[PDB]
């Protein structure tokens, strides 16, 4: 079993039955876009993003990386390189909870995101190295 599969078994995605977003939830968004805060450990920097609610987790990470490296003068092709590398090496975690975004569902299909939208709370997500998460798995 891959480390990803073991992590999927130990921390199953907490998602709703369908990717269709109910009207009363969808209508609180800004033309379908949700504002979320992504934390990174650099020390901890915060990044506030506005993204399509149906971005899958890997696209959220791409956007955080885009925000973080803007004003760093990378060429167009270098930003794409950074994105590919950050994507495969990090996953998103809910701040203050052992819930992970391990599966490729739309962001708005995760219960935590839907709960934030309905309740008027800002979603706070932590960017976290895959190898850190895999270290949390039961030792042999």
Question: Packing angle between helix 76-89 and helix 57-69, nearest 10 degrees?
Answer: 130
In the block, residue with structure tokens 């590919």: 84
* DSSP SS3 for 96: coil
Domain extents in the chain: 3-136
Q: Is 71 left (phi over 0), alpha (psi -120 to 50) or beta?
A: left
Architecture of domain 3-136: Roll (3.10)
Cα–chain-centroid distance for residue 50?
12
Q: How far apart are the first and last CA of the chain?
A: 14
DSSP three-state, residue 103 = coil
- Are 104 and 98 in contact by the 8 Å Cβ rule? The answer is no
Both tokens of 31, joined, read: 């033309």
How was it solved?
A: X-ray
Data resolution in angstroms: 2.3
């Amino acid at each position: 079993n891959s480390p990803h599969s073991r992590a999927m078994y130990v921390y199953p995605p907490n998602v709703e039955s369908s990717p269709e977003l109910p009207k009363h939830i969808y209508n609180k968004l800004d033309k379908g876009q949700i504002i979320v805060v992504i934390w990174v450990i650099v020390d901890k920097q915060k990044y506030t993003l506005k993204i399509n609610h149906d971005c899958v987790p890997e696209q959220v990470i791409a956007e955080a990386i885009r925000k973080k490296t803007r004003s760093m003068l990378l060429s167009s092709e270098q930003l794409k390189l950074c994105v590919l590398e950050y994507q495969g090496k990090y996953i998103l975690k809910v701040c203050g909870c052992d819930e992970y975004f391990l599966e490729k569902y739309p962001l708005s299909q995760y219960k935590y995101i839907r709960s934030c939208i309905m309740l008027g709370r800002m979603p706070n997500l932590m960017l976290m190295a895959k190898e850190s998460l895999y270290s949390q798995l039961p030792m042999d």
